[PDB]
């Protein structure tokens, strides 16, 4: 087989070589919460993704689905640029 | 259960996330999972309004007004009585009166506050 030395030429990466953003030491994934005295980690286990849907005052129309909604769409966006990326 | 727009509950609770426990009020709307419950809230010394919805696990109806009910049906019921008394109004607690005592019940003792 030839060698796959094709890489992904996304805009993401061009971004950075044009700018001073060095890329993320990946630290871990052990963020920090309030008022629950313990690190509930962003992503990974019952993050703080579904936190703001399990809480039970959303005080500000159902507005704990627009939530969902939202990150959903933020996801398809994210498949989108992938795909668009795709055709590097 | 079966909650309706404009019925009266209390914020029921089962590390709370927050401090709205007690604050009762009254549902202004309702969907599928999700009820909105009006409550009021003041800065210094001017009161504002509040929007505020609860997840239906933690609410539970308010039983106040069956007092008002129960005192409408009294009154009612004396207003008809009197057709064969007056002076239906609520009355406070009055100071107690005066009452004889003997001591055959119980010698009065001493309790030495040494303590012991």
């Known amino acids: ?88 | 259960k079966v909650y309706k727009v404009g019925d009266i509950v209390d914020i029921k609770a089962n590390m709370p996330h927050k401090f709205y426990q007690g604050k009762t009020g009254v549902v202004y709307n309702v969907t599928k999972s999700s009820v909105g419950v009006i409550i009021n809230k003041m800065v210094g010394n001017r009161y504002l309004e509040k929007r505020l919805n609860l997840r239906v696990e933690h609410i539970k109806h308010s039983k106040c007004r069956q007092e008002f009910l129960e005192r409408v049906k009294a009154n009612a019921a004396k207003r008809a009585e009197a057709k064969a008394a007056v002076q239906l109004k609520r009355q406070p607690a009055q100071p107690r009166e005066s009452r004889i005592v003997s001591t055959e019940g119980n010698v009065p003792q001493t309790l030495a506050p040494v303590p012991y």
């Open chain 1, 1 to 88: 087989k030839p060698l796959p030395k094709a890489k992904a030429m996304t805009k993401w990466e061009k971004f950075a070589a044009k700018k001073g953003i060095k890329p993320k030491e990946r630290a871990g994934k052990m963020i920090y919460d309030e008022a629950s005295g313990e690190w509930v980690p962003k992503w990974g286990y019952k993050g703080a993704n579904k936190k703001l849907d399990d809480q039970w005052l959303v005080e500000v129309i159902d507005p704990r689905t627009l939530n969902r909604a939202e990150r959903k769409r933020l996801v398809k966006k994210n498949e989108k640029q992938q795909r668009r990326n795709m055709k590097n």
